[PDB]
Design a protein around this ligand. Structure first.
Ligand SMILES: C=C(C/C=C(/C)CCC=C(C)C)CCC(C)(C)/C=C/CC/C(C)=C\CO[C@H](COP(=O)(O)O[C@H]1O[C@H](C(N)=O)[C@@](C)(O)[C@H](OC(N)=O)[C@H]1O[C@@H]1O[C@H](CO[C@@H]2O[C@H](CO)[C@@H](O)[C@H](O)[C@H]2O)[C@@H](O[C@@H]2O[C@H](C)[C@@H](O[C@@H]3O[C@H](C(=O)NC4=C(O)C=CC4=O)[C@H](O)[C@H](O)[C@H]3O)[C@H](O)[C@H]2NC(C)=O)[C@H](O)[C@H]1NC(C)=O)C(=O)O
Ligand SMILES: CCCCCCCCCCCC(=O)OC[C@H](O)CO
Length: 210
């Protein structure tokens, strides 16, 4: 139930209402590896593109025979639009409208604002529509880098949540399927390759996962 934070997007300022969520946490207030868990898994060149990543997608496709640089179907900006629009059936017309509106979102907002709308208005499972709500509910940890009161979200937990949003009703944190732990393992490897974490952090996280 997140209907209030959804709409038809008559104006892109409708996304500003996500800022009034009680568990809202700004991207600026999160540790880099937390944001990197999502960026690395969903849209590696998030900061560099204008919501479409046409160049990087085309290179990943035709520069190498390997699928090493191939990413998922949607940039974070496209995921923000899809999650702001009311729940609906997935089709090429709705995807096309989302692409169009993503261009309007990129024009108005900076990358940290877009990333804040992303992490505070996507489904993580168990009625959690914010990254802070999810970290609290699942681990009792926090994504606010300034907290002196609460245990800080780990590298592993950040990767678990960044992978979880692809199938939040299916991927189960308590009883992780082989597929879910493969997704998380790949997420940890991408965080390392994209320099959000180091070998120490990576091994500690892989050890904890295993
Ligand atoms: C330009 C051209 C070129 C064309 C031509 C012709 C050439 C032209 C040339 C010329 C002219 C010369 C056109 C091509 C172009 C533009 C590229 C077009 C492409 C076409 C693409 C197509 C075909 C379609 C577009 O759509 C596709 C598909 O869209 P999605 O399905 O939305 O996207 C998912 O898949 C993508 C993918 N396949 O790549 C993805 C990986 O990119 C998405 O990942 C991310 N990160 O976005 C992935 O999204 C996730 O999908 C989950 C659902 O997965 C799907 O589940 C289906 C089953 O229902 C399966 O059949 C699908 O296979 C599977 O993908 C989202 O999770 C859902 O989130 C909801 C909020 C949950 O609902 C809530 O659940 C709650 C609950 O209690 N849940 C529970 C708990 O919490 C615990 C137990 C529970 O039960 C409550 O019940 C509540 O009431 C309820 O509302 C719901 O339960 C939950 N579902 C699951 C399975 O977890 C989850 O929230 C959602 N994440 C986000 C951030 O949006 C697309 O956009 O790619
Ligand atoms: C919750 C009860 C429904 C059974 C499905 C459990 C599931 O996979 O949910 C995922 C869970 O929210 C995360 O750990």
């Amino acid at each position: 139930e997140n209907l209030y934070f959804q709409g038809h997007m008559d104006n892109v300022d409708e996304l500003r209402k996500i800022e009034n969520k009680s568990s809202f946490v700004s991207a600026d207030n999160m540790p880099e590896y937390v944001k990197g868990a999502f960026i690395s898994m969903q849209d590696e060149r998030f900061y560099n593109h204008h919501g479409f990543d046409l160049k990087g997608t085309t290179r990943a496709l035709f520069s190498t025979i390997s699928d090493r640089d191939v990413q998922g179907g949607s940039t974070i900006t496209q995921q923000v639009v899809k999650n702001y629009f009311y729940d609906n059936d997935r089709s090429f017309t709705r995807k096309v409208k989302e692409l169009f509106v993503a261009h309007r979102v990129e024009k108005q907002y900076n990358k940290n604002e877009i990333l804040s709308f992303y992490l505070n208005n996507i489904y993580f499972g168990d009625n959690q529509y914010t990254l802070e709500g999810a970290a609290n509910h699942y681990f009792g940890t926090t994504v606010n880098k300034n907290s002196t009161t609460m245990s800080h979200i780990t590298v592993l937990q950040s990767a678990i949540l960044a992978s979880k949003v692809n199938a939040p009703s299916v991927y189960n944190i308590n009883n992780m399927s082989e597929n879910f732990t493969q997704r998380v393992s790949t997420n940890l490897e991408k965080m390392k390759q994209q320099n959000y974490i180091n070998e120490t952090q990576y091994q500690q996280a892989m050890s904890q996962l295993n």
